[PDB]
Amino acid sequence: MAAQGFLLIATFLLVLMVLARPLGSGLARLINDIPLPGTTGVERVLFRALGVSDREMNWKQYLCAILGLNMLGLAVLFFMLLGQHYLPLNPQQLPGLSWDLALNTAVSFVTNTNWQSYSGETTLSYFSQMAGLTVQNFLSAASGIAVIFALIRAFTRQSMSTLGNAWVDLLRITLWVLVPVALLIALFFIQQGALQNFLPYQAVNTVEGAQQLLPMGPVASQEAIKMLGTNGGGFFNANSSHPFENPTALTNFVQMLAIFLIPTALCFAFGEVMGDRRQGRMLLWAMSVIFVICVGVVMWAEVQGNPHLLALGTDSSINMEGKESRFGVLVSSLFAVVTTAASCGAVIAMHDSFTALGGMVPMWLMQIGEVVFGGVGSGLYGMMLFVLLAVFIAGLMIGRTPEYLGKKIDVREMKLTALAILVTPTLVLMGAALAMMTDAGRSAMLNPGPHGFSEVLYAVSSAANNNGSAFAGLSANSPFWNCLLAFCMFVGRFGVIIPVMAIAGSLVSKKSQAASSGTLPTHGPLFVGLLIGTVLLVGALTFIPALALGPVAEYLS
Amino acid sequence: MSAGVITGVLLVFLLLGYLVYALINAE
Amino acid sequence: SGLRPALSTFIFLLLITGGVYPLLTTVLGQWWFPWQANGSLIREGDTVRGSALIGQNFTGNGYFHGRPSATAEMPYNPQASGGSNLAVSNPELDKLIAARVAALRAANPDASASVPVELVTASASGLDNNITPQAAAWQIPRVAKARNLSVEQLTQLIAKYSQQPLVKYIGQPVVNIVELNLALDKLDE
Amino acid sequence: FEPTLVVQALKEAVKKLNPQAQWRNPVMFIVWIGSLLTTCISIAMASGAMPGNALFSAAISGWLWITVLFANFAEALAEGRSKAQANSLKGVKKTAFARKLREPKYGAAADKVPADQLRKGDIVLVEAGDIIPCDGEVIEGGASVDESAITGESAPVIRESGGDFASVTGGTRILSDWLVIECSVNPGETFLDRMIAMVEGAQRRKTPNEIALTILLIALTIVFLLATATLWPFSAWGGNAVSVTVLVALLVCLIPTTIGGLLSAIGVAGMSRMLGANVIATSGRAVEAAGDVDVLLLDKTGTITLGNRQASEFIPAQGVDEKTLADAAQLASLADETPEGRSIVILAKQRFNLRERDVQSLHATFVPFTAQSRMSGINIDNRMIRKGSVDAIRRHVEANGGHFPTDVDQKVDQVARQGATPLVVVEGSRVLGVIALKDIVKGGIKERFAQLRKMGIKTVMITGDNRLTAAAIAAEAGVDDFLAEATPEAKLALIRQYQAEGRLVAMTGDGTNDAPALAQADVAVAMNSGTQAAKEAGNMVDLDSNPTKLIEVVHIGKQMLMTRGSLTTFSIANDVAKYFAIIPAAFAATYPQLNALNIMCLHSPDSAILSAVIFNALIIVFLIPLALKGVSYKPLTASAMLRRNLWIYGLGGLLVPFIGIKVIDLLLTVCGLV
Ligand SMILES: [K+]
């Protein structure tokens, strides 16, 4: 299996680089405001109709467009989930949400995360499922790419004051990248047997005397959206292990490619726009080293598995409690690192029921800041804040001034990256601090001992870091959790995007300079060993007491 | 719910009310 | 600012991604894949016997027992779609495993002493239709005793319904159960 | 190493910091909070409290108050005395007692009055030799004053009554005669208080490297505040809690005081380095800025002069033989004491060498420098051999009817436009010739500025001296630009010009007019020929008095940043590795199965903290010898200088807490205190 474990990652990274290579060539047109060669004036039909005048925007005007989109993107969704009963295509007569669970998911779907604290097929009703979710992941993914495009444009431009047009970005990204590529994947799921219809709930006369009701709905159209846009909120409660969403192992390997289909190609587009490709080919290189290590730990931590299983008289100690036999043990091990290093939120294997080491590493790779091949948009500027830190301490420890991509980096451009990196490990030691004090948050656990502490910690670590992966033993339908996470997901996102647009605002008016004795070559793996020794370090400085009281205490006991 | 419980929380909030104010400025 | 370009773009993306996109999948779904997109149901005549994806509850002695389910109201309840979220360090899981261990030994007296882990441990989705062939081969002698059938046709029947993946390591060799227990029942006559 | 009179005078400033005025040092203030409320626990522990071991928490409290008292001892030694702004420039105004006349006419009742009562519009008398008490205009008399306070020149300037040239300024020194003046402005608006209040409160700008790691002073504590102060809600659920005496001490051990004391550790290091270059420094900030200065400013008077403002090759003349002419130049310099007369005596031994003439064997009435005629002179013969300026003698030439030839003015067309100060000598009523006194420069001066421009540094020369004087010397000094005839307020607006550009500026001057420009400057270099006001206002003082020796200052400052980045890689990897030494040992109260994380075989969670604080106390101490005794640099590229720095000091940053805690925990075991 060790060769099968080695082949599984090495097949996965190799096919990923082949698919993401031309996609990085494609997005480089969109960064430079160069229209795609398929449709050029076809766009100009639409911007006349929408009144989007292709006018340039500074960061204060740019940031209030995205935040204006997301708040407006919530106000429709916050009204749909209340008046869900008044909306068509409901196969049952399902009432609308309670207002706390209305508020939590209305935050959750705008905010690239989709913390589901319910069951969709029991509660959602095919129209807030359709026109409140599938329309919203296509925003939140594009709302991430609109940020990181305004970050890359802040590096390649010289002494301007503008960052493109916001509304032109979002229409190019959705209608030419997010829509048609997800259309090709959604047709692929049905070929292997996913579910996509508008039928009402068909009952089943079983082969035994019992019965069961089957759920239906527009699932396979939604299913290719969230795996592309790193969004994770599936139709069902088994939101990727359910067979209607992932019926074959071949649909799994496309889904795993889908979670890094965009946020790897953004690194290729990063190297192409900035001239030298090696700036991306170290940035790609600095995430795989954390990735390949953190997968092979979890694959080893499941071949070990529970020793109590073989003690009770089973065949082997291989943990198949919280997994799916339709998929592999190693393949559930690969996905659980993939779906938690990449801010996605999909679940093929109930992470609460892993081993102790197998649950620490997904809990680790969120708390790092969601950098290691992270979320669509939110991974790459989540990385580029750490890049502006490891460059910053490097010039601080040589003596000269920091200078990255030719531009000098001053104090105002460094207070902000000290702010944004001190948000997503601030909230998870304020949210988890707030829950573990009170009797509201402690009442919703499932298991005693130090592992039940992780069920509180993994939730807020999947809230401020905007993942959406759930232990789901945590009964999070109480109004305390539904108000805690909705505050932890709003600030953990828009307390990052706002200081990015202040970072990406300030790097535009500056100008690149020549090489010097202060300019490090920011490529080459003699510098990557400084980045990973910083990206892993801020997660180590903030969470080793948070984790040794969690799954490490489970592991030793 | 006591002065040996909640008043330690108010102190640590004040240090973040201090350190962040020390981080916004080059005082 | 905050007017016709700012508002109508969000309206237009609503009209695409909820208007165009799900029905464009739905129209292209039935036009190309009519059986899967409707649900991949199995209907003997007009008797909906469940899909080839879900798995019913199988407590019959002359059937294959699937993986234990542990959904909300009852095992294999597609109104729940949850999973047994019990920790490894939870002793209450060790109660529930020890139930399923001793239940299978009394149910499978002529089988091996060890038990394959898939039959005793639950599934993540709660609706796992599938087990490995090695576990399916372990519960041969109970079923062949009940249905009064021979092994070499039964292993021929299991290999008939053994969905292997495209490569070795993408998944596992997979045995469907609902198609297997229906064809077992049609083989009775 | 410093004299103890300097050292012990600074600990009084240390103990005054300890109230709520250390909140501007963000790391050590949090150390002060824990050290405050470890004593609040321990004093309440001995009186009555739930914990029992007071001797434990006492030594917890003890070394922290040693640490704050040390880290403020290091900083007050290093920072300064950097804004010891104006004492001697201020102390003149407190000693500004002045005689005044009770009646506006000359020959009135006089009384020496201190400077408080000298309000606007007061009849005040200035006799010769004294200074000017306040601003205003001269109403009676005529005299020559020296305006070195406002212009920085040792040249006497005219000051008459009844004219445009009457606006006196309070602070300058009178030389020749009496003057009756009257105060035109209110007290507090006088030019001294226009200069005192402009020097004091003028704020230094911190260097961007200094600003940089003060963020990582804070960007590590905000991590370490949260990861400690949330254990008590993370452990109290998990059975027993962690006690407050641990968690307050656990908060303070992890706080990066290693990079907290780094600001002073580079401060006192270069402070010891500048003494080797014959340079007294007074600020640790001022040492590090020397490796970054791109524009440095000069005063051409005092620094580029030598206080001389005097020369000649010989004496030009118009058809007049030089022999009795230059002998009269000796005669026109016998009675004078100023070196301007003495250089003419040195000119007398250049060519004609007729020095052998005693002062009183010649029997001449020594005419002092007047103010009505504005000339000195001597009467040995029947003739009057008078010495004076150009235009003052132009009164005396017309006073005796004759007219001097215009070629004498054509000498002035050459003397002034060489940048010299002219002098005319007249025997009787007959003009002899023009004596030209120009500046001389110190030494090998152009060879320094040639090096100084090739180190990427501009060179601007600033004065209140004339343009036509300064333009020739600007060509004779190799400087880039020159601004002449400038007020001292214009020097700050020039430094505020270049510090608007984000650039570090190094003023070098001598006079009290330069004391504003020595305030807002970064490397403010004083001069020993300069006054005791500018030495106070100066952030750094030469001992050998060469203004061009910023080159040795930069080659020390560039050594400092090479050693500064070396100390960071130690200290920025010290406190990160300190974090792994203390956190796993601080868990055994909560879960007993976390004993396996006690890597260094430590005795108790109480044991490791006592070793940590003492490790956190030695390490601020040991930086200063690690900045001095043991010091390293070698010029490299951008890349491998980091690679050279991570092997030597970065890998050393990991071991020292893992080494140091295992040492101190055994000294708490072999002696066995607790
Ligand atoms: K993020």
What fraction strand of chain A? under 5%
Multimeric status of the protein = heterotetramer
**How are the strands of the biggest sheet of chain C laid out side by side?**
3-5-4
N-to-C SSE string of chain A, H for helix and E for strand: HHHHHHHEEHHHHHHHHHEEHHHHHHHH
Structural class of chain A: mainly alpha
Number of continuous helical runs of chain A: 24
Q: Can you describe what's shown?
A:
The complex is a heterotetramer of chains A (557), B (27), C (189) and D (674). Chain A is an all-alpha fold and 557 residues long. Helices cover 59% and strands 2% of the residues of chain A. Chain A folds into two domains: 2-268, no CATH class; 380-556, no CATH class. Chain A has 24 helices and four strands. In chain A, strand 3 and strand 4 (407-408) form a beta hairpin. By secondary structure, chain B is mainly alpha-helical. Helix content of chain B is 67%, strand content 0%. Chain C has 189 residues and is mainly alpha-helical. Chain C has two domains: 1-38, no CATH class; 41-186, no CATH class. Chain C is built from eight helices and five strands, in the order H-H-E-E-H-H-E-H-H-H-E-E-H. In chain C, the strands form two sheets. Chain C has a three-stranded antiparallel β-sheet with strand order 3-5-4. A two-stranded antiparallel ribbon of chain C has the order 1-2. In chain C, strand 1 (41-44) and strand 2 (47-51) form a beta hairpin. The longest helix of chain C is centred in the first third of the chain and has 29 residues, at 4-32. Chains in contact: A-B, A-C, A-D, B-D. At the A-C interface, helix 1, helix 3, helix 6, helix 7 and strand 1 of A face helix 1, helix 2, strand 2, helix 3 and helix 4 of C. Bound molecules: potassium ion. Potassium ion binds at residues 370, 378, 382, 466, 496 of chain A.
Annotation keywords:
heterotetramer, C: 189 residues, mainly alpha, 2 domains, three-stranded antiparallel beta sheet, two-stranded antiparallel sheet, 8 helices, 8% strand, D: 674 residues, alpha+beta, Calcium-transporting ATPase, cytoplasmic transduction domain A, Calcium-transporting ATPase, cytoplasmic domain N, six-stranded antiparallel beta sheet, five-stranded antiparallel beta sheet, 24 helices, 45% helix, binds potassium ion, membrane protein, P-type ATPase superfamily of K+ transporters (SKT) potassium uptake system four subunit complex
Provide a compact summary of the structure:
The PDB classes it as membrane protein. Chain A has 557 residues and is mostly helical.
Secondary structure elements and pairings:
The complex is a heterotetramer of chains A (557), B (27), C (189) and D (674).
Chain A: H1 2-31, H2 41-50, H3 59-80, H4 99-110, H5 120-123, H6 128-156, H7 166-191, E1 203-205, E2 211-213, H8 220-228, H9 249-259, H10 261-273, H11 278-283, H12 285-304, H13 307-312, H14 329-341, H15 357-367, H16 380-398, E3 403-404, E4 407-408, H17 412-420, H18 424-427, H19 431-437, H20 450-461, H21 479-494, H22 497-506, H23 525-548, H24 551-556
Antiparallel strand pairs in A: 1-2, 3-4
Chain B: H1 7-24
Chain D: H1 4-15, H2 26-47, H3 54-78, H4 88-94, E1 98-101, E2 110-113, E3 123-126, E4 136-146, E5 156-160, E6 167-168, E7 173-174, E8 179-182, H5 191-199, H6 208-229, H7 231-235, H8 244-254, H9 262-265, H10 267-274, E9 279-281, H11 284-288, E10 295-299, H12 300-304, H13 322-331, H14 339-348, E11 365-367, E12 375-379, E13 385-388, H15 390-399, H16 406-415, E14 420-427, E15 430-438, H17 446-454, E16 458-462, H18 467-475, E17 481-483, H19 488-498, E18 505-508, H20 514-517, E19 525-526, H21 532-537, E20 540-542, H22 550-582, H23 605-628, H24 639-670
Parallel strand pairs in D: 10-16, 10-18, 16-17, 19-20
Antiparallel strand pairs in D: 1-2, 3-8, 4-5, 4-6, 4-7, 4-8, 9-20, 11-12, 12-13, 13-14, 14-15
The complex binds potassium ion.
Potassium ion binds at residues 370, 378, 382, 466, 496 of chain A.
Cytoplasmic side (chain C): 1-4
Transmembrane segments (chain C): 5-33
GO cellular component, one term (chain C): plasma membrane
